[PDB]
Every structure is written in C-alpha cells, then in structure tokens.
Design a binder for this molecule. Structure first.
Ligand SMILES: Nc1nc2c(ncn2[C@@H]2O[C@H](COP(=O)(O)OP(=O)(O)NP(=O)(O)O)[C@@H](O)[C@H]2O)c(=O)[nH]1
Ligand SMILES: [Mg+2]
Length: 168
C-alpha cells in the first residue's frame, strides 16, 4: 500500500457502527450483534486516485456513561464516520455531542462524514434526508445514507471519506 489512513467509527449505541465495519472489511453482517467490548479495528485496502490506501477502521461502543472514549482512541485518525440511525431521532440529536467529542479529543482537521445508517428502514424514518444533508453542509461535514444490511452506499461511504482525506 501507498498510504495508511486511520478512520474511527463513532455514534450512539445501536446505530450500526460494528456492522458498517464488518460489511466494509469482510462483507459480513449480523442481525444479532452485541454491544462492542473494548476497542476493535480492521483493515481493507482500496484504490483512491490511482493509489492503494490501506484503511484502518477503528470501532468501540457508543455508550460512555462509566467509561469515556479518550484521545488515545482518536490518535492518528484522519477521518471519522459519525453514524446515526435514520429510524431513531435521538441518535441524530446526539450528533452535536459527538461533534463536541471530536473537537475535544480528535485532530482539528479530521475529515468528518455524517452517516445516516439503516436506510433500508425508510418506512420507519425519523430523520429527513434533506434536514441531515443541510445540517452537514452547514457544519462542514460530508453526508451519506447507508445500509449495512443491504449494502447500499457502504463502499461509497468509506471510498468517499478516504478520497476526501487523500485530497486535503
Ligand atoms: N435494518 C438494519 N439494521 C442494522 C443496520 N446496521 C446495523 N443494524 C442492526 O442494528 C443493531 C446494532 O448494530 P451494531 O452494529 O451492533 O451497532 P453498534 O453501533 O456497533 N453498537 P455499539 O455502540 O453498542 O457497539 C444490530 O441488530 C444490527 O444488526 C442496517 O443498516 N439496517
Ligand atoms: Mg458496536
């Protein structure tokens, strides 16, 4: 590979972070996945502007009550996938909180992609696509909706953020 880019997954418990990771790196999905224990990471190489980018994707539980995610989790990260669940409005309301965590614990110029996951649950949607896109636009974030379940836009989400990082 030509470059190694560390990218972190963050977002509330249950939004689909671990399945976004497994879908992208192993093409695997699990309806019966449990809350993540400690910290995990996995890799996949992809082509970006004629270069081979080894994407090192980090993952951890969204809940931070007794245990808060430290600057060590974010160290070296050049991107963050900030994931919410399109069918749960609270997870979108908490995006502001995750942005604060990034400001507190992550690099100043970390590339942020706001990810509305579970787009296959369109019939249960609680967060309008236009509102989220507008919010992203107004806060200097990229935006995409994904479904780890049916694979829609998962490759595109990672390919796009890794492209934006490469092109900084
Ligand atoms: N319908 C649907 N379900 C999904 C999707 N992505 C994940 N899920 C489901 O949502 C639940 C939680 O997914 P998971 O990946 O474990 O979430 P998490 O964000 O890693 N949770 P935690 O922060 O606690 O580790 C699981 O039942 C999983 O199968 C998706 O795109 N669509
Ligand atoms: Mg998880």
């Amino acid at each position: 590979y030509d470059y190694l880019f560390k990218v972190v997954l963050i977002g509330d418990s249950g939004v689909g972070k671990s399945n976004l990771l497994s879908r992208f790196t192993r093409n695997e999905f699990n309806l019966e996945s449990k809350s993540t224990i400690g910290v995990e990471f996995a890799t996949r190489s992809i082509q970006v502007d004629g270069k081979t980018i080894k994407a090192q994707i980090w993952d951890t539980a969204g809940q931070e009550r007794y245990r808060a995610i430290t600057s060590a989790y974010y160290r070296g990260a050049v991107g963050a996938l900030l994931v919410y669940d399109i069918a749960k409005h609270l997870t979108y309301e908490n995006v502001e909180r995750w942005l604060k965590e990034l400001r507190d614990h992550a690099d100043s110029n970390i590339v942020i992609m706001l990810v509305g996951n579970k787009s296959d649950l369109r019939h249960l949607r609680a967060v309008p696509t236009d509102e989220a896109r507008a919010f992203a636009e107004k806060n200097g974030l990229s935006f995409i909706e994904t479904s780890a379940l049916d694979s829609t836009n998962v490759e595109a989400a990672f390919q796009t953020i890794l492209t934006e990082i490469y092109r900084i």
